């Protein structure tokens, strides 16, 4: 029995390490920057078209060395961010015991359905009520500025902010969040899985770790685990609606081409 709780504790630690090794941004780094003690050079704030063009000239000059409409340039930046996060999540996923042992097609499927849920979960770490860190911690873009973009672009982020304000009130730390992201990835009920029985067991193992970790790490909040279970179902719906919105953009905006990796993830998703 001690051999088991020892392995549960150990597994929680190893997932936390894989998370620290693989993601460029985490909640601790984001709060340092935001606090914001004591980074030498604080984030450029982007709150209107002028500050956006300034940030662009210094932070992604290529995209403006040419130019497309502001809303489209921001959408391109969003995509580049998602592509990089997808790459980070892939490596994190391969560090989870048993993931890399799965059928390549089951791995693809867990990632396909999991990445955007994990992305919006982790996005919360860089969001407060006023805005969100962007460009690897070097800029901060305001919620109001995003809302002010023309339709449909102004509809992208608000729902993510709304999710984040509630997720953030849970006061999770990175050790909590690494496990949550692991449980999102190892999900037995993704559409089209081959070896469902094995993955359900893997899922149950991870959730067991998460449940015990939350018990140790948050003894003040006895309902924390059912709360997270609900957040997972919320993320599922948040992602369904995001993809619906993405399809609308792709279909009606002549100048907003989807990156090929992201089209692959979205294809036949929901």
């Amino acid at each position: 029995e001690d051999s088991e709780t020892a392995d549960l504790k150990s597994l929680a630690k190893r997932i936390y390490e894989a998370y620290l090794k693989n993601f460029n941004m985490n909640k601790v780094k984001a709060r340092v920057i935001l606090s914001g003690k004591a980074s030498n050079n604080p984030p450029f704030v982007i709150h209107d078209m002028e500050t956006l063009c300034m940030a662009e000239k210094t932070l992604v000059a290529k995209l403006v060395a040419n130019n497309k409409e502001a809303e489209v340039r921001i959408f391109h930046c969003c995509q580049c961010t998602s592509v990089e996060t997808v790459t980070e999540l892939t490596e994190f996923a391969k560090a989870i015991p048993g993931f890399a042992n799965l059928d390549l097609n089951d791995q693809v499927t867990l990632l396909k359905y999991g990445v955007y849920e994990a992305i919006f979960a982790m996005l919360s770490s860089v969001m407060n009520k006023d805005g969100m860190l962007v460009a690897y911690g070097n800029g901060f873009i305001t919620r109001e500025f995003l809302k002010s973009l023309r339709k449909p672009f102004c509809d992208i982020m608000e729902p993510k902010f709304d999710f984040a304000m509630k997720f953030n009130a849970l006061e999770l730390d990175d050790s909590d969040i690494s496990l949550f992201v692991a449980a999102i990835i190892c999900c037995g009920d993704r559409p089209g899985l081959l070896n469902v029985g094995h993955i359900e067991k893997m899922q149950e193992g991870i959730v067991h770790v998460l449940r015990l970790h939350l018990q140790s790490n948050h003894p003040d909040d006895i309902f924390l685990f059912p709360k997270l279970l609900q957040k997972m179902a919320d993320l599922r719906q948040l992602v369904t609606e995001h993809a619906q919105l993405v399809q609308i953009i792709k279909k009606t905006e002549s100048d907003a081409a989807l990156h090929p990796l992201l089209q692959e993830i979205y294809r036949d998703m929901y």
């Binding site: 490596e91 391969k94 990632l111 692959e264």
Partner: peptide, 11 residues
């Protein structure tokens, strides 16, 4: 063959 398959095999 797919981009995701490639990412998964990348390393």
């Amino acid at each position: 063959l797919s981009l995701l398959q490639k990412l998964l095999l990348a390393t």
